[PDB]
Amino acid sequence: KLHKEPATLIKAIDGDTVKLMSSNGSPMTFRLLLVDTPETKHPKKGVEKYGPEASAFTKKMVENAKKIEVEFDKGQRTDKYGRGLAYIYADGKMVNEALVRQGLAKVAYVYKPNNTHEQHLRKSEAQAKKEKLNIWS
Ligand SMILES: Cc1cn([C@H]2C[C@H](OP(=O)(O)O)[C@@H](COP(=O)(O)O)O2)c(=O)[nH]c1=O
């Protein structure tokens, strides 16, 4: 149902933003749907706590994968900054979920109709909270 396709890593930027080579054949910046990892680049809030950890996690995950796939939700495919909005998978593992599960991101920016995996992400977030991991420590 959801549109999914292969992509190739260009570079990991931070915990929730990565540059990939789309099936299109064009280099694009992707921002992970439904999550927010702590900031590491913008002068507002600074280098938030867990930022570097979130960044390291994502980098590790995409750099070690055999296969990267991008899955678009049902509504808009790009944000106002021109970033592609998707669920990213590394060897069939959802990075968006992986981060939440570890308490390295919170569920955020839920913009209907792009919320197909919201409940899934929410459950993982509840578990991380319950286990008092990283952000929830
Ligand atoms: C995740 C996501 C973020 N965004 C926008 C909202 C925020 O804009 P503003 O910058 O105007 O606040 C910003 C959050 O991204 P970052 O966490 O990368 O900064 O990107 C969307 O528009 N749609 C989305 O699905």
Ligand SMILES: [Ca+2]
């Ligand atoms: Ca962020």
